[PDB]
């Protein structure tokens, strides 16, 4: 979703799963068009990965698998 | 079936319990 | 002009500041007797404020976008009054102080109980020594050339 | 018309910050959240009705407690800009005309 | 030891160092034999150190895993999910 | 100092209000009021008696960093001797009480070392520092988003 | 008298009198030439 | 056996010999100084008389005359206050209209533009608004002109001169000896009956003839200059008979025992004056009369010279039981040979008294036009709280000094002291547990509330609407007090305060003097926070006192003296193992406790009592009851109290309250500065001064008094004093700027 309109959508870092959360907190943290509470990324990895060529989720999946391979080696 | 529903308790509750019990057991007695 | 600043006398924000400042004091003067002690004191400071703004304008200070007189220290000769001539004056006074102190320390270093003359000042010796600071620059120059300003052996 | 000083998110702004009311129409500046909010007019520009105290709230003294209302009335043809001296640096400034 | 004024004797260091047990009963089992024979027969398989520890850890672990992977919405709002439309950010959203 | 300077200059540039910095940055009351006290309203309003919003997690962390920092002062001000004697009387208390002297420690409790305590206090201080400033920075830029 | 002269030259009293004189001098100077951001004579 | 005046003639001749010699008392100091450390020692042990010598007689003579010097300083301060009120004040203008003019008795000279501090305090006057509450005292005493203030200032000046002279006299010409000091029976007989009994009887005499009629005239609305002078009220009696008819019989009621005929001006009303917002003066006069009678009888308990009375030794050694062995036997010998024991007892009692004074003065305002002067009220409460706390910490300091220096079981043995020394470990362990439990269940509740509120779960919070923790005991007690007048104090009409209840709000000039103070869950939480902080500082101080001589850590701690750095980094590290170091912490925790107390007071008052009344009786408070809902979480304190209240001081610049803003920032600075001394050690600094000394020596400008870094103890002392100065001063600036701007 972010690659389609980089200026008008907030990037998501990861989902939140916290059984200590209340209902208004669940409603307050669901941003970025997600289906639940999420965190908004400020690392800037979205812009970095977008600049270097990654476009789809399959690209990121191949990347993560390759890096798991690299760290195992 | 929701994967967080399983891994966040196990890694947040079970894993530290097991690891800390084991590490206490290892650190606090003589060989 | 220098650094894009403009001569305060011809700036508009500098004037606006002056008029605004003067405005508030005038309000403080009101609600009291027209010729009362407090009112007279407020008048005095109003005239003082007008004199300060005119003095700033006259001295040719540089004003930015806020109208505050900025100071140039690059060495431009149109601005030595801002930093460099006061700097020379300071260096003179500070050398005076330090040289008099050093002179005193050297003079009292030869007694058996030199700490006695440090917790309790010999004021006659001090008053004999204070005025050598007047010529401290020449004395220090000739002491450096002599090689006696810096202790050898250390 | 009622203007809430301060936002529920703690944002330092007016609600609505910019608007237009009718003639002789009283505008109420209410405090919503984030109080010591003080509404002080620009005193600059604003063609006619150049009194300061008539619409301004004097510096130092400001709205007290969670919900406070300093009632002003304008009634001057022209546009005026009402801001908050402590917060006008965070953008808590507003413009209100009566055409 | 305790001969009027002395309190130190090499032969009985424990008495000298106060190695007493100030509250132990030294009495017989107050529980009736029949009752004792009911418990130590049913609670026996839980008295092995490694066995009890491993079983406790893994049983409680799968207990938590099951009870949280299959909790209903009325227990945890985190799994009920949001119920409202979302707002927009200051400019984004 | 470096990051305060950077953040304030940029947070006034992003609002098109650079004169606000240009004028209030030359005195320290300007730094306190126009930067710290001013840009901290949304953050501390992350949660209030009237509800919470998405900034709450920062409003919490902001206070977290204040707590950690503060406890770092303990290990930096109070010194070992005090704590060692307190610990020894605690040991007496534990050994002397019924139903709990049945349990025995295996290492004699000692107060932290001198160097160890300086290290712990420094760690607390720096962690509190980093956390509260990160909370404030991300909440004050994220709140205005500009 | 001799001892009073001595005590009046002990370090704290010598320094308070010196700094009071210096303060008086600076106060009067700025009372005659107030609001001076530069050296305007030459 | 019998008691008499016993003196010594010219023990020390007044002379300027020792002024020329720095540290004459210390043999090592007298010789002279080798390093910079000698200068610091000279000051640190100037007033430690019990170490300059060992003679009790000399110590006590020095103590007596030092007390005289202190009294002289206090008198000079009082005369300065009165003179400034006479000459540089707007006291008469304030006297004409109290609730519009702001009191101010200090102006500044227009030197560097600082005249902006001469703000508009009203009354054709420009000065610095004072918070001393002196105007209220002067009005309650009946002072109507500035001639009376001038006369008072000059009288106090000559009293300061008299005190200084007496100090010189009783040390250099006629100095008492030991048996004169060691008489405490007659001393107590005179301080109870003579100083407090006659003092309060004399003050009641003043109020009956001066303050009562003059304040009656002032409250009737008379112009202050049209009021008869006080001495007229003594010369012409029908002047008083007009205001108070039963001044006509004139002291025959006092001897017929028809005391009811005095019911006019000797009342038992209670409550506040609805006109002035202070206590009824006819109540204060009666109060001081009864106080005088009580003290005059009480100063007749101890036997001095005529058989009748009580021997303190007998009373003490009569008290002992089966739990305490021979308790109280031997205390009379301890409390008459060591000044530190007496000093610590008196310091504890005086601190307790000061804090009780703060509470009672906030609750039952005694002066007219004081209650509605919010700045004065806040400042008085805060100041007395701080003074009380400092005194209470000094009590512990000197108890420890006694234990280290003067305690001796070989010659002066007491049983109770010995028993407490013998189970100090049980004492400290239980106090430790109480501190931990109290800290978990008071501050833990705040942390729980903060996370419950941040997780969007307010129902689970410990609040007035989710989970109530109601202080049922305090509510019950204050409801018992509200019902007291008429039920169980039949002679009273109003309850003793208005914070108890009964409605009956009292206002003055559109501002609220007092109203019933409600106690909810937030009050419960903050009261337990108070209990926690007090218990922890008590733990620190008591642990310092009980373990001052020896411990299981270092077995001979007394030989190292009361104050010392350490005994090396042995046994794991013995940093600050001394009694003096325990006092250093207690000051930190005393600061914490008193800070929380004054914050609680200020917020609660600005939220539920103070504020402005209006025409219907609608009370708008300074903050609309924001204390009951926002004070239950720490975010509420940081946002609604500090951040909100802090805005006043930040905006002070550019006005007459600018000095408060300046002091705010300066106090922040000096507080942060203390941390340099509190976090570092003197080794680094000695090693740095080494190379600085090298730099000086390279240019023949090195000093002869060798510069040393401060001692380890001195560095801690500099660090704690700067810390306290910074914190207290920033709170002072914040409070004053806020309450003067919003008040
Ligand atoms: C306008 C254009 C023309 C300008 C002409 C300017 C001339 C200089 C200025 C003033 C000259 C007159 C000074 C006052 C008259 C008496 C001065 C004097 O003889 O007073 C005596 C002293 C003596 O000076 C020197 O004093 C030195 C040290 O003596 C003593 O120095 C101290 C003097 O108290 C102490 O006693 C100390 O213990 C002891 O060492 C030297 O060793 C010699 O003895 C001696 O030459 O002069 C002093 O500086 C006295 C202190 C003031 C000196 C001012 C110098 C100029 C500035
Ligand atoms: C260092 C990388 C990293 C980090 C910081 C996280 C962080 C997180 N993961 Mg995650 N994860 C990772 C890698 C990582 N993951 C990888 C490589 C995979 C496989 C593709 C996963 C698969 C995964 C799943 C399926 C889930 C998470 C979830 C989560 C979140 C809940 C915490 C948790 O349950 O732990 C993580 C749980 C795991 C099963 C991770 C196991 C895989 C990694 C490689 C384990 C590494 C352990 C290793 C021995 C220790 C490394 C040393 C160092 C990290 C201290 C949390 C924010 C949960 C979530 O979505 O929260 C909403 C969730 O359900 N992760
Ligand atoms: C904000 C900083 C801070 C904090 C939190 C503390 C806390 C404490 N101090 Mg300390 N102190 C401080 C600053 C601080 N101090 C400073 C700057 C100084 C220098 C003057 C001192 C000097 C000092 C002395 C001299 C003494 C203490 C003592 C104590 C303890 C008092 C007993 C108690 O309250 O039990 C309760 C604990 C608390 C109230 C802390 C908060 C508890 C949290 C909220 C509970 C959360 C639990 C959580 C679930 C943990 C699980 C997390 C999980 C991930 C592991 C306490 C732990 C006294 C003591 O030792 O007590 C016997 C003691 O004598 N302090
Ligand atoms: C604790 C007592 C106290 C304090 C804090 C002050 C403080 C102040 N007084 Mg005050 N005063 C006091 C007692 C006090 N006074 C007493 C007891 C009297 C006599 C009854 C006076 C008579 C007095 C007068 C007449 C005036 C002040 C003034 C002032 C203000 C200017 C300070 C100053 O002295 O100018 C500068 C300081 C000096 C010039 C150095 C002082 C040296 C003199 C000769 C005395 C000290 C010498 C000492 C004995 C050695 C200042 C805020 C002035 C003022 O208010 O301005 C409007 C002013 O005119 N005072
Ligand atoms: C009715 C008799 C009387 C009175 C009024 C006082 C009053 C006082 N005594 Mg005192 N005393 C007395 C009898 C009395 N004493 C006796 C019989 C003994 C034992 C023999 C002592 C031994 C004693 C000691 C050891 C000390 C005091 C101290 C004090 C002062 C306490 C501080 C204070 O409260 O400030 C209140 C301030 C005032 C009340 C201002 C008024 C001051 C008046 C003028 C005092 C005049 C009373 C005095 C006894 C007059 C007799 C002396 C005469 C020959 C001139 C106080 C002024 C302390 C002190 O000396 O402080 C310096 C202290 O150290 N007293
Ligand atoms: C130490 C306190 C004190 C002092 C110095 C005085 C002094 C005086 N009182 Mg007085 N009085 C006092 C306390 C005091 N009173 C108290 C506490 C009460 C309340 C019980 C009274 C009630 C009282 C009455 C009713 C009268 C006096 C009167 C007088 C004056 C008569 C002169 C005389 O003959 O004697 C005298 C100046 C008489 C008076 O007013 O003189 C004109 C008078 O009628 N007094
Ligand atoms: C009636 C009250 C009283 C009295 C008579 C004494 C008397 C004494 N105390 Mg003591 N004490 C008291 C109260 C009192 N104390 C209180 C309330 C505390 C708690 C803080 C203490 C804590 C205390 C300690 C820790 C120690 C003493 C010590 C001593 C003895 C030597 C004091 C000395 O000469 O040091 C010299 C005095 C000074 C160096 C003054 C220091 C200046 C202060 C710190 C700055 C104050 C700042 C000022 C208020 C505002 C700033 C001004 C600036 C900006 C210009 C002495 C017998 C010392 C001792 O060894 O006993 C034998 C000791 O170490 N006291
Ligand atoms: C335990 C709660 C309590 C308290 C704090 C008080 C307090 C007070 N009562 Mg009260 N009283 C109480 C219970 C209480 N009473 C009860 C249960 C009754 C019966 C219903 C009364 C009946 C009563 C009457 C009839 C009067 C008071 C009065 C007073 C006031 C004068 C006190 C006094 O006489 O000096 C003490 C008297 C002594 C002989 C000293 C002995 C010390 C005691 C006994 C211990 C005083 C403030 C008097 C008043 O009206 O005040 C103006 C009065 O007339 N009370
Ligand atoms: C104007 C600002 C610049 C001023 C420059 C002044 C001259 C500086 C160079 C000469 C320094 C000097 O002579 O002393 C130099 C001083 C030592 O000074 C030397 O002392 C010797 C023994 O007493 C002899 O007397 C030499 O004549 C003397 O020069 O040391 C140095 O500054 C090192 C530089 C090389 C010498
Ligand atoms: C103030 C002036 C003090 C004068 C002074 O101390 O010197 C005068 C003398 C010191 O002067 C000494 O006096 C002695 C006899 O009194 C001897 O004559 C000594 O020779 C003489 O030096 O001290 C005083 O007399 C002042 C006493 C205290 C005055 C206050
Ligand atoms: Cu505002």
């Amino acid at each position: 979703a972010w690659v389609q309109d980089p200026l008008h959508v907030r990037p998501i870092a990861h989902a939140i799963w916290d059984p200590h959360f209340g209902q208004p907190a669940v409603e307050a943290f669901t941003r970025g068009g997600a289906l639940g509470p999420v965190n908004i990324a400020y690392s800037g990895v979205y812009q970095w990965w977008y600049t270097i060529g990654l476009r789809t989720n399959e690209d990121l999946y191949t990347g993560a698998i390759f890096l798991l391979f690299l760290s195992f080696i | 079936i929701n994967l967080p529903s399983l891994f966040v308790p196990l890694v947040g509750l079970l894993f530290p319990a097991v690891a800390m019990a084991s590490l206490f057991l290892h650190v606090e007695k003589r060989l | 002009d220098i650094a894009g600043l403009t001569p305060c006398k011809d700036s508009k924000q500098f004037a606006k500041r002056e008029k605004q400042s003067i405005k508030k004091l005038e309000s403080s003067l009101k609600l009291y007797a027209p010729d009362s002690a407090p009112a007279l004191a407020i008048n005095a400071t109003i005239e003082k404020t007008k004199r300060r703004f005119d003095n700033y304008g006259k001295q040719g200070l540089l004003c930015g976008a806020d109208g505050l007189p900025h100071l140039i220290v690059s060495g431009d000769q149109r601005h030595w009054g801002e930093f460099i001539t006061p700097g020379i004056l300071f260096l003179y006074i500070a050398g005076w102080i330090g040289w008099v102190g050093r002179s005193y320390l050297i003079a009292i270093r030869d007694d058996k109980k030199p700490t006695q003359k440090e917790i309790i000042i010999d004021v006659p010796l001090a008053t004999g020594l204070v005025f050598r600071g007047f010529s401290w620059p020449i004395a220090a120059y000739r002491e450096l050339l002599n090689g006696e300003l810096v202790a050898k052996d250390v | 018309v009622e203007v809430l000083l301060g936002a529920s998110d703690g944002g330092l702004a007016f609600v609505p910050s910019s608007l237009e009311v009718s003639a002789g129409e009283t505008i109420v500046f209410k405090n919503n959240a984030g109080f010591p909010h003080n509404v002080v007019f620009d005193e600059d520009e604003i063609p006619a009705g150049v009194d300061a105290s008539k619409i301004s709230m004097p510096e130092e003294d400001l709205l007290n407690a969670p919900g406070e209302t300093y009632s002003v009335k304008l009634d001057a043809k022209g546009t005026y800009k009402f801001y908050c001296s402590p917060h006008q640096g965070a953008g808590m400034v507003g413009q209100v005309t009566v055409n | 030891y305790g001969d009027k004024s002395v309190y130190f004797d090499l032969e009985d260091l424990g008495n000298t160092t106060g190695q007493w047990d100030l509250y132990g009963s030294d009495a017989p089992s107050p529980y009736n034999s029949l009752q004792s024979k009911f418990f130590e027969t049913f609670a026996a398989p839980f008295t092995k150190r490694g066995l009890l520890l491993k079983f406790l850890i893994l049983g409680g672990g799968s207990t938590l895993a099951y009870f949280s992977a299959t909790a209903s919405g009325d227990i945890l709002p985190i799994k009920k999910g949001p119920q409202l439309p979302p707002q927009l950010g200051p400019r984004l959203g | 100092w470096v990051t305060f300077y950077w953040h304030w200059k940029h947070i006034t540039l992003w609002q098109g209000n650079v004169s606000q910095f240009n004028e209030s940055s030359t005195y320290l009351m300007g730094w306190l009021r126009d930067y710290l006290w001013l840009n901290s309203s949304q953050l501390i309003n992350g949660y209030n008696p009237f509800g919470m919003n998405s900034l709450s997690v920062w409003a919490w962390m902001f206070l977290f960093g204040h707590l950690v920092w503060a406890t770092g002062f303990m290990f930096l001000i109070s010194w070992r001797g005090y704590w060692q004697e307190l610990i020894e009387t605690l040991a007496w208390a534990h050994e002397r009480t019924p139903l709990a002297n049945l349990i025995r420690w295996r290492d004699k409790p000692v107060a932290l070392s001198i160097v160890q305590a300086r290290l712990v206090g420094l760690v607390h201080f720096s962690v509190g520092y980093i956390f509260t400033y990160a909370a404030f920075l991300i909440a004050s830029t994220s709140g205005k988003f500009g | 008298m001799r001892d009073l002269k001595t005590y009046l030259s002990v370090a704290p009293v010598a320094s308070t009198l010196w700094f009071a004189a210096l303060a008086g001098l600076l106060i009067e100077i700025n009372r005659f030439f107030p609001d001076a951001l530069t050296f305007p004579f030459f | 056996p019998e008691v008499k005046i016993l003196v010594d003639r010219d023990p020390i001749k007044t002379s300027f010999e020792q002024w020329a010699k720095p540290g004459h008392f210390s043999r090592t100091i007298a010789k002279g100084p080798d390093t910079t450390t000698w200068i610091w020692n000279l000051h640190a042990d100037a007033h430690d008389f019990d170490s300059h010598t060992s003679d009790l007689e000399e110590i006590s003579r020095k103590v007596f005359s030092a007390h005289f010097g202190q009294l002289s300083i206090i008198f000079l301060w009082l005369s300065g206050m009165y003179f400034h009120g006479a000459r540089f004040s707007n006291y008469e203008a304030w006297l004409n209209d109290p609730t519009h003019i702001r009191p101010s008795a200090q102006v500044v000279w227009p030197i560097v533009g600082q005249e902006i501090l001469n703000g508009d305090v009203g009354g054709g006057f420009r000065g610095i608004q004072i918070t001393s509450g002196f105007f209220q005292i002067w009005r309650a005493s009946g002072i109507t002109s500035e001639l009376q203030l001038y006369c008072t200032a000059i009288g106090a000046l000559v009293f300061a001169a008299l005190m200084l002279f007496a100090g010189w006299f009783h040390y250099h010409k006629a100095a008492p000896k030991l048996v004169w000091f060691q008489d405490v029976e007659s001393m107590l007989n005179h301080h109870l009956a003579g100083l407090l009994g006659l003092g309060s009887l004399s003050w009641a005499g003043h109020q009956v003839h001066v303050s009562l009629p003059i304040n009656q005239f002032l409250n009737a609305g008379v112009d202050p200059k049209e009021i008869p002078l006080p001495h007229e009220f003594i010369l012409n009696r029908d002047l008083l008979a007009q205001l108070y008819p039963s001044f006509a019989e004139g002291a025959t009621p006092f001897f017929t025992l028809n005391w009811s005929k005095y019911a006019d001006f000797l009342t038992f009303r209670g409550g506040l004056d609805p006109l002035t917002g202070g206590l009824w003066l006819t109540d204060i006069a009666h109060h001081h009369l009864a106080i005088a009678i009580l003290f005059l009888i009480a100063g007749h308990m101890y036997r001095t010279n005529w058989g009748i009375g009580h021997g303190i030794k007998d009373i003490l050694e009569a008290h002992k039981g089966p739990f305490t062995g021979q308790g109280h036997k031997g205390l009379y010998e301890i409390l008459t040979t060591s000044w530190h024991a007496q000093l610590s007892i008196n310091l504890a009692m005086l601190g307790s008294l000061t804090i009780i004074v703060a509470h009672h003065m906030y609750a039952m305002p005694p002066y007219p036009y004081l209650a509605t002067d919010y700045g004065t009220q806040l400042s008085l409460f805060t100041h007395h709280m701080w003074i009380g706390g400092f005194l209470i910490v000094g009590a512990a300091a000197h108890a420890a000094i006694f234990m280290v220096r003067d305690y001796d079981p070989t010659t002066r043995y007491n049983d109770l002291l010995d028993r407490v020394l013998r189970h100090r470990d049980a004492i400290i362990s239980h106090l430790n547990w109480v501190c931990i439990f109290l800290g978990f269940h008071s501050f833990g509740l705040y942390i729980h509330n903060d996370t419950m509120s941040a997780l969007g779960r307010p129902q689970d919070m410990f609040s007035d609407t989710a989970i109530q923790l109601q202080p049922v005991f305090a509510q019950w007690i204050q409801n018992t007090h509200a019902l007291a007048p008429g039920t169980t104090a039949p002679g009273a009409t109003t309850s003793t305060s208005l914070t108890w209840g009964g409605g009956d709000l009292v206002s003055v000039g559109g501002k609220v003097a007092l109203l019933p103070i409600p106690l909810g869950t937030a009050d419960f939480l903050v009261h337990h926070i108070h209990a926690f902080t007090i218990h922890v500082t008590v733990l620190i101080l008591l642990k310092g006192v009980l373990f001052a001589r020896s411990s299981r850590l270092i077995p001979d701690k007394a030989n190292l003296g009361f104050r010392f750095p350490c005994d090396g980094p042995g046994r794991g590290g013995t940093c600050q193992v001394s009694a003096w170091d325990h006092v250093f912490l207690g000051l930190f925790w005393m600061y914490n406790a008193i800070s929380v107390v004054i914050f609680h007071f200020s917020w609660k008052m600005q939220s539920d009592v103070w504020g402005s009344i209006n025409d219907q009786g609608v009370v708008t408070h300074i903050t609309g009851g924001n204390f009951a809902q926002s004070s239950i979480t720490i975010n509420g304190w940081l946002r609604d109290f500090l951040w909100a209240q802090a805005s006043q001081v930040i905006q002070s610049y550019g006005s007459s309250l600018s000095a408060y803003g300046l002091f705010f920032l300066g106090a922040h600075f000096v507080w942060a500065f203390s941390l340099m001394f509190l976090f570092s050690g003197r080794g680094y600094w000695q090693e740095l001064i080494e190379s600085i000394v090298w730099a000086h020596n390279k240019l023949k400008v090195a000093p002869a008094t060798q510069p040393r870094a401060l001692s380890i103890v001195q560095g801690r002392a500099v660090g704690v004093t700067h810390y306290l100065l910074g914190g207290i001063a920033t709170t002072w600036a914040f409070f004053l700027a806020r309450i003067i701007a919003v008040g």
Side-chain angles (χ1 to χ4, degrees), chain H residues 427-475:
Chain H
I427 299 173
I428 289 308
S429 36
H430 294 73
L431 196 35
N432 184 301
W433 169 77
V434 176
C435 291
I436 298 201
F437 160 79
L438 295 174
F440 272 142
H441 292 76
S442 49
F443 182 65
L445 301 192
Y446 278 82
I447 300 305
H448 163 93
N449 269 2
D450 264 294
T451 72
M452 288 307 72
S453 209
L455 286 177
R457 296 165 54 183
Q459 61 284 2
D460 303 340
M461 276 194 303
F462 281 116
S463 95
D464 276 322
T465 167
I467 298 180
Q468 329 221 345
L469 301 163
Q470 297 296 315
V472 306
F473 301 138
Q475 296 168 4

Side-chain angles (χ1 to χ4, degrees), chain H residues 217-287:
Chain H
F217 260 74
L218 271 161
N219 295 341
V222 174
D223 183 279
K225 304 194 304 195
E226 282 177 336
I227 317 192
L229 292 171
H231 55 79
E232 303 186 29
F233 293 128
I234 309 202
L235 302 149
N236 197 334
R237 185 153 64 79
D238 61 44
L239 257 57
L240 249 56
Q242 286 146 21
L243 298 177
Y244 296 115
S246 88
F247 260 86
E249 307 87 337
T252 87
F254 178 85
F255 297 99
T256 167
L257 288 212
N258 259 335
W259 288 10
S260 35
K261 286 205 271 217
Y262 278 141
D264 183 359
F265 62 101
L266 287 200
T267 40
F268 208 115
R269 310 171 65 144
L272 288 203
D273 191 351
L275 181 50
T276 81
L279 302 166
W280 294 105
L281 283 197
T282 73
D283 267 358
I284 302 181
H286 192 355
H287 154 269

Side-chain angles (χ1 to χ4, degrees), chain D residues 1 10 13 17 19-20 27 36 41 45-46 56 66 69 78 80 85 91 93 96 98:
Chain D
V1 186
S17 64
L19 177 63
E20 292 177 350
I27 183 56
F41 270 80
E45 269 61 2
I46 76 180
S56 178
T69 59
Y80 357 106
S85 287
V93 188
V96 63
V98 156

Side-chain angles (χ1 to χ4, degrees), chain C residues 141 143-148 150:
Chain C
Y141 181 80
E143 210 140 295
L144 160 75
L145 288 204
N146 279 5
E148 310 330 307
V150 46

Side-chain angles (χ1 to χ4, degrees), chain B residues 1 5-6 9-10 13-14 18, chain E residues 53 57 61-62 64-65 68-69:
Chain B
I1 212 173
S5 295
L6 185 82
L10 251 53
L13 280 203
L14 190 159
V18 165
Chain E
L53 179 74
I57 284 201
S62 35
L64 196 67
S68 99

